[PDB]
Structure formats: C-alpha cells, structure tokens
Paper text:
Bacterial conjugation is the primary means by which antibiotic resistance genes spread among bacterial populations. The recent cryo-electron microscopy (cryo-EM) structure of the conjugative Type 4 Secretion System (T4SS) encoded by the plasmid R388 revealed that the remaining VirB proteins form a large assembly organised into four sub-complexes: the outer membrane core complex (OMCC), the stalk, the arches and the inner membrane complex (IMC). In this article, based on additional data, we present a more complete T4SS cryo-EM structure than that published earlier.
Further analysis employing 3D classification reveals a degree of heterogeneity in the positioning of the two extra TrwF/VirB9NTD-TrwE/VirB10NTD sub-complexes within the I-layer. We obtained three distinct OMCC structures, each characterised by a unique arrangement of the two extra sub-complexes in the I-layer. Aligning the structures of these three I-layer conformations using the O-layer as the reference underscores how the variability in the positions of the two extra I-layer complexes impacts the overall I-layer structure. Although the structure of each complex forming the I-layer do not change significantly (RMSD of 1.06 Å), a shift between corresponding complexes in the superposition of conformations A and B or A and C is observed. In both, this shift changes in magnitude, being maximal in the superposition involving the second extra sub-complex (that in orange in Fig. 2C i.e. complex 10 in the A versus B superposition and complex 11 in the A versus C superposition) and, intriguingly, being minimal in the complexes opposite (complex 2 in the A versus B superposition and complex 3 in the A versus C superposition).
Residue numbers in the entry:
A (entry chain i), B (entry chain f), C (entry chain c): 21 to 266
D (entry chain b), E (entry chain e): 150 to 153, 177 to 297
F (entry chain Y): 199 to 247
G (entry chain h): 248 to 297
H (entry chain g): 17 to 44
Amino acid sequence: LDVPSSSRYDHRIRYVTYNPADVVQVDTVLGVATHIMLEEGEQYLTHAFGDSEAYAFARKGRHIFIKPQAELANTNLIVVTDRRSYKFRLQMRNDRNGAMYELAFRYPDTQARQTREANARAAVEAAFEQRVGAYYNLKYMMSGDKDIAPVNAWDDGRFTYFKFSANADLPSIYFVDAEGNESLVPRTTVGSSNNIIAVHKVNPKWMIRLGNRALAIFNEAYDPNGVPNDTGTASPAVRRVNKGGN
Amino acid sequence: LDVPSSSRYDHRIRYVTYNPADVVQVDTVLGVATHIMLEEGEQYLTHAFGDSEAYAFARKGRHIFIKPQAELANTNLIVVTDRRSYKFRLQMRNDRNGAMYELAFRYPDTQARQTREANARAAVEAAFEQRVGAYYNLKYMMSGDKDIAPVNAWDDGRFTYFKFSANADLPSIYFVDAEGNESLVPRTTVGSSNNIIAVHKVNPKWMIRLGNRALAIFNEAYDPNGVPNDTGTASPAVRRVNKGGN
Amino acid sequence: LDVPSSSRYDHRIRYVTYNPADVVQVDTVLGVATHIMLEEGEQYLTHAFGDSEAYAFARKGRHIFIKPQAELANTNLIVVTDRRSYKFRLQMRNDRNGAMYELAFRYPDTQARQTREANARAAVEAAFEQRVGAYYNLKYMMSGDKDIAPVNAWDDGRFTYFKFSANADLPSIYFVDAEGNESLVPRTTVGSSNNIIAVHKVNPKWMIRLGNRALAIFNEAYDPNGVPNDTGTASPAVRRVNKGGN
Amino acid sequence: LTAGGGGGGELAEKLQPMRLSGSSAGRLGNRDMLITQGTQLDCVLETRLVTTQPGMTTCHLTRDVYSTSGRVVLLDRGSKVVGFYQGGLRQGQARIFVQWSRIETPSGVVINLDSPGTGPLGEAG
Amino acid sequence: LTAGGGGGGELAEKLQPMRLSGSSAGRLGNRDMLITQGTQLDCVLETRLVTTQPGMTTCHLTRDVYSTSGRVVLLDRGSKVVGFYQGGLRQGQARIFVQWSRIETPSGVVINLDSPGTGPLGEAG
Amino acid sequence: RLGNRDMLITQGTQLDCVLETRLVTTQPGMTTCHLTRDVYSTSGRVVLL
Amino acid sequence: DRGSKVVGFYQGGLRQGQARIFVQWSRIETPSGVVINLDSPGTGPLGEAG
Amino acid sequence: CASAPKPKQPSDFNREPVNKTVPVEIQR
C-alpha cells in the first residue's frame, strides 16, 4: 500500500511514485471529485471497477475524474494504458475530512531513462567538439582568378576546408579528377560567420568557379591512403550504431 | 493447484509461472475486479466459464477482467489462446481479504524457445566468422589506370576481394571472359569501413572501371578446380537445410 | 471404458489414448467446463448428445467445451470428424469433486499411419539409390574451346553426366544428330554441389556452348542398343504403376 | 440430438510549387534469406530466339546466386529460368524486351521473379 | 458456457491582381539523421545503358554520403541504387530521363529516394 | 517449394517430338506429332510421358 | 546566411525563338537548419526573367 | 556507318603486383 503524499501548500493535492507492483491508496470522501493525472502521450486503453456503479468515471484524453455515487464504497479501480497499468484502492472516508482533489504521478523510470538520453546527447556533442588527434594538411597552392580565392585552405584527412573573407562572395567548388573533368561534391558551410566551405572529400585538385572567374586549387601533399572511417560518423570518438534492428 | 506468490509492495499483486498441466488458484473476493494479463502477441480465441452468470468477463486485446456477479461463485475458467490455453480455479473468499488485483504469468516455454533460437543464431554466427580452413591467393597483377587501383586484391577460393584506400572512390568491377568480353558480377561491400569489394566469383581476369579510367586485374594463380560448395553457404561450417519440406 | 489419467501437477487435467474400439469415461461435476481438445488440422464434422438439454456444448475450431446443464446428466457424446469419430461416456458427479478441466489425447492411429508412409518413402529412396549392376562408359573425347570443358564425362547407359569444376560456369549442352544439327535435350543438375549436369539421353556426339565458345564431345564407345526401360523409372528397382485405374 | 486576386494566369501557374514528400529509411529483415532489387543473375540462354512469333524463352543459371549479405546461396547453379517475349520489333529497334517469369532451383524451390532480361552488361532487352 | 460598372473588358482583365501567399520559415528536426533536397549523390553506373527498350539501371555509391550537419555517414559507400528509364528519345534529344528508385546500404538500410538521375555536373538526365 | 518432384513436369521442359502431318498453312488445320524420347520428371527419376 | 542551399526545377523546354528557360526556385535551407518554401522565379544576374 | 564507341581499353605495359604488402584481413 503506497500512500499518496500531500503537498506542503495544501494537504489536498497528493503525489505518488508509480510502481508496477503496488496499489495507490485513494482515500475519497463524500461529494468531491478526484482528478487522476495521467502521463502525456499515454493511450488510455481500458478501465475496470470492482463495483462500477459506486463511482462516476469520465475521461477526456489523459484526464481522469472519479466521484463516489453510492454509500459505503470500498472497491478497486484499475486503468490500463498503452504502456502500463494503474492500481487503486478506493476507500471512502465517513467523516468527509481530508479529501483528494488531484492525484499526480511521478515516474522514476521514465525520467531516469530521459536522464540517460540527456547524458548520451551531451557525451556525443562533447565527442564531436573535442576532435582529438587530428592532423592538418596545409600544402595547398592556387593559380587562376585570385579575386575569388580563399584566404585559407586545409584538410584534416577527411574533409577539405576553404575559408573566405567577409567581403568575399562564397563561390562554387568542384571536384576535379585525373583527366580534368569537374563534378559535383557535397559541401557544408561551417564557421561562426559561415566563412568556411567544407567539402566531404580529400582530392588532389579542386575547381572554384564564381560567375565567369575560375581558380584552381592543388593539394600538394595528397595522401591516397587517408584514415579509414570505422565509426560511421565524422569523428573517431562517436559511433553510429544500428538502432533499427529488424 | 498452482497458488501464486505475492509482491512485496502489496499482497494484491500476485505472480504465477505457467504450466500446461496445472491450474491456478484465483481468489475472487466481493467488490474487486481482477486483472489477468496475457503476454504480448498472444491471440485470444475463446473462453468458457464454469458459470457464465456467476462472474463478469471483459476482454480488450490481451487483458482479462473478471468480477464475481453472484454468491457462491466457485467455478472454473478455461481461456484458450493461439499459443496456449490457461486454466483457472475461481473461488470467492467470503471474508473480503486477500484480494488479487493482477495475476501476472511468467512463461518458461517461451523463455526456453527464445534461449534455443538465440543459441542457434549465436552458433551460426560463430561458425560464419571463424572462417577456418581458408587458403588465400595473393598472386594478382594490374595494368592500366593505376589511380583507381586497389591497395590489395586476393581471394579465398570462393570470392575475390579488392581492397581500396579511404580516399579512393569505389569503382565498378567487371568479369572478363576468355574472348575479352566484360559482364556484370554480383558484388558485396565488406570491411570495417566498407573498403573491400567482394565479388562472388574467382576468375583469371577482372576489369575495374571508374568514369573514363580503366584498370585490368590478372589472377596469376588461377585454380580452375576451386573448392566445392557442398553446404549451400559461404562457410564449410554452416549448412543450408531445406525447411519448406513439401 | 478408457479412463483418462491425471497429471502429476493437478488431478483436473487428464490424458487419454484414442482408440477406435473403446469409449472414454468422462467425469463431469456441476458448474465446471470440460475442454475436449481435438487434433491438429482435425476437421470437426458433427456431434450428437444423449441429451442436448443436459449438457451445454460450445466449439471453436478444434476446441470443444461441455458443461452439465441438468440433474442426473448421464448421457453420451459422439463427436465425429473426417479423420475419426470420438466417443465418450458422460456421467455427472453428484458430489462436485474429482473434477476434469481438459481432456488431452494421444493418437496411435495417426503415428502408425505416418510410420507406414515414412517406411514406403524410405524404401523407394533406398531402391533409387542402390543402383546395383551399373556399367559406366568413360570413353569421351573433346575438341574445341577447352576453357568451358568439363572435368569428367561419362554415361551409365541411360543418362550422360558432365562434371564441371567449382570455379566453372555451367554451360548449355546440346544434342547433335547425324547431320550435325543441334537440338535441345532436357537436363537435370545433380551432385552435392550441383557440379554435374545429367542429360536424359545417350548420343554419339554433344555440343557445349557458353557465350561464344563451343566444345564438341564425342562418345567413342557409343552403344546403339542401350538398356531397356521396362520399369518406367530411372532405376530397375522402382516400378511405375498405374494408379489412375479406369 | 444437437442443441439447435486570380490574375497573373501564366506566371502564377508557372509558380505553383512542386511539393515532393520526404522518405523515411527502413531496414531489411533477414539479409541471409534475401535477394534484393538490382541483383544481377547471370544465366546462359538455352533456346535459340527468333522474334517472328511470340514465344517463351529459357535459360539456366551459370553461377550460384548468394544472399544480399553474401553468406547463403539462395539460387543454385543450373537453376532453370523461364521467360517470354512478344510484340516484335519496330523499325530502328535492335533489342527485344524479354520478361523472365520464374526460376526453379535444382532442389525444388520456385520463386516468381517477374524481372527484365538484359544483355551481359545490363543493357535492356 | 459464455456470458451473452463592368466595362473595360481587356484592360480590366489585364489589371486582375496576382496575390501570392506568404511563407513562414521552419526548422529541420535532427540535422544528424537527415539528407535534404538538392544533395548530390555520386555513384558509378554499373549497367551499360541502351534506350531501345524500357529498362532498369543500377549504380553504386562511390563515396560516403553525410548528413546535413556533415557529421554522420548516412549512406555508406558501395550502396546499390536501382533506377529505371522509359519512353526513349525524340528527334533532337541527347539525354534520357532516369529516375532512381531505391538505395540499399551495405549494412541493410533501404530508403526510397525517388530522385532524378543527372550527369556528373548535375545536368538533367 | 514444388510439392512432388517425382510426379511433375515443369515449365520450360523441352519435349522433343517428330512431326507426322505435313504442314501447309493455307487453311487453318490441326497438326500431330509423336514423342521421340521418354520425358522424365524434374527429379529425373520417373518417366512421366 | 551565405552558403544557404536553394533548390529549384525547370520543365517544358524551349520553343523556337526563345533563349531563356523558366526556373522556379522552390525551397532554401540555411546552414543552421532553417527551411522556408519560397516559390520564386529564377532570373539572371540583372533580374531578366528566366 | 556508325557504331557505339567502346570503353577505354587499359594499356598492357605497366603490369605490376597489386599487393605491395599483405593485407591485415588475412590476419598477416
């Protein structure tokens, strides 16, 4: 028997920590309506009374109202939602003292699970931001129309970064292969001021076009081997794991 | 007469382990509704009371609600389902003590079946990964556009593996016949970082193409006889057994 | 009077062995439901009581429930199915003791029938396998494109077998007549690893084609006379008999 | 015995959105008992083909076909595939559409693959 | 056992307003598990293509494809894309419209991207 | 799965027969031929035709 | 922001005497995740239609 | 008078081993 705990402001609002192997001791009185407060997103499925006509039951979504509609009602209420089952021991008070207006639940299990994802998301973000053990290639040379040129270009072994000044237009960057053909390469724009274009490849030669002006970028320390992507992410400290199961 | 065992938080929640050759003692006091819970996926077909008028019945999916609707309602409940068939011995406690709110079943049969299938899956997986009795051919030459070349090529007697570095685009690999004609060969991309292309055939010559660049691979130690596939799988330690019968 | 035998767990659960020559002694107490479970795939046809008014009957597929509905319920139940007709002696108990919840069966007739079919199939398979007194012609030559050649060719006087290595594509094999015309011959792939094409004919010459490569196969000990097919099967031990009668 | 404003007509019609609904990724169930779309089955053509009259073709698999995981052989070598063509050629055409209908394993497995037959390098027809 | 004035026709039709409804900006939910419209997937064509008959194409991703955030590999390299064309060319056309239908990841992920297939620089068909 | 392979002839089986009637396609007509060889089952063990 | 990816489409092709195709830009994506459906016309560098 | 071009044929002059070092997938 778990007794709902009254608030410090008024003894008439009560809280209980849900327990799948326990029953809530509901001390109802004459002529008051008790609000049972269910969890957000719970799909109410069924309720059952051990004495149905002793109590009045109405539901609106996740809100439960009960009220004693008969004399000497000592019965049980069990309401099953999509995730769990609730247990109640409805004992009426003869003296009509110390009623129950709202009964609210606390879920250690659900908030504890959510505590896990908050911690895990924080760990994932920290792992992306530490970027430990990265080697940077700076041997990049350029030749062409220098007015669309970056101020800095480098790669970390996985992506290639071109940094542009604030007064420059951000041009379009193309992947140049061995025979000289240009092809599309995906880009993401990073940096606090969005001044860096990160392309998702390391290549020996690059093409930068803007309007009718062209600039060629040459990686002068191209490493064919590179570093393998064993984790599924852009960081060695974050693993992409198969959730879908199936 | 399997008498269930109560929780510690409240006597009103009681558990019993299923058994197909025993019945469960259910105590149905006056004024309570008992929650009989079936396992997920279990399909209810029908049921039969010792007295239909004696007790109240209500099912919603896999949830059974019962309630004594008459005096001296001492009867039997037999509810049959897709998987199993339960057996209850309903008997009212005239003193309105020892009420039961839920009857939770623990099933050793499904547990044994899951443990058996999990063990079989683990054995099959271990046999696949062990790959003992494997002979490796490493006598491979190449001539052509070396920029799309593998860093390694070998074969194990059944499949040919081409390994590519991390900065290399994965090319398309074709099967070359005696007259020089290329044709498709089925492909699977394996390796921790998807760096190995495994083609499902051992052949003297291979064609690697990426764009307008081409590279020819030559198996210098081609073994026409190979290793016979008597088991139906890629491993000699895993059979492929005809389930369908018919 | 086949008396069902109780289980070691609860007396209410009893087992009986079916017999086309004995009746089952069914003991019913008042206000309990007896579950008489039928066989798998067992198609219930009809039943018939001594008193439709002494026993309540409910059926759902292969599940049959009964209930005593009158005093001195001393009647008989005969439920007939396509496989078999059951038979029970229904005797109501005036003490409400020694109840029966389910009646579970065991079927010697079905397993006896199954063992005959298994024995017949096993005998036929043994006869197909034994293949005693077999002479094999091995004088086969070949000329043409040897890259598609078999590793072994022979015939047993009825079929011709070409064995191909593991790393070899299986080609298409054609019948060559006296004028040099090729025509389709039926084939079946045999061997543990599907390495052998058995063609259903013995011929002096064969042609093997794979793509644009051809290989001629010559039977250098061709027997025009062969071994007659007096049985109608591929083996002299198995006889094909006319079931259709008419 | 038994119990019982409307204007801008051209420019506004050219500015109607094309709203393509997004997709959501799934996952294949058992990849050891599964051959997925786009797998190339290499077979050898048995019947000589002449497209005067509609007719049925036949070929046999030259090689084993493995599952999408590359671990289990799902279609054996020597499996008989049965197809058909119809309709003939038009002027300027040089390839006939062949649909393959069913494949029979040398051990009794039949699966209805109603697939397009192609050339040795995947060219249609 | 069981329980239970109207004139100015030309000029006043040329002055009919074009009222185009405004838009409201939204936000992408998880930019780590999302590949958005206009991402360029670089694959390598496997089947040789001849547009005499309607057919089905196949290609494999040459590179890893990252999320919008550029932080997670969503489509691995070597993933098999399956497409199709139909209808053939008209006089004066030199490009066929190929639609790519599904992509299968080497780890078993399938997603229905029903996208236009383009050339190496995104020119349609 | 095919049920009984010893009592089965499947699609794509080639039946070799020899034409009896001379064929001239001026008028619609009926042809006739006789099997030259025994035709076995898919298992290759029983002569079905 | 700059680097925001804009996605459009064209259709129909040109007729004789035409030298500009009508492109409609459909949606834009900000490098920080903001997407707004702008179904605007695509023009040349000085606003000439198509 | 017109036949579809063939793909590039690789040159046969620079024939060299593919495996400069043994892979680690052989566990060597």
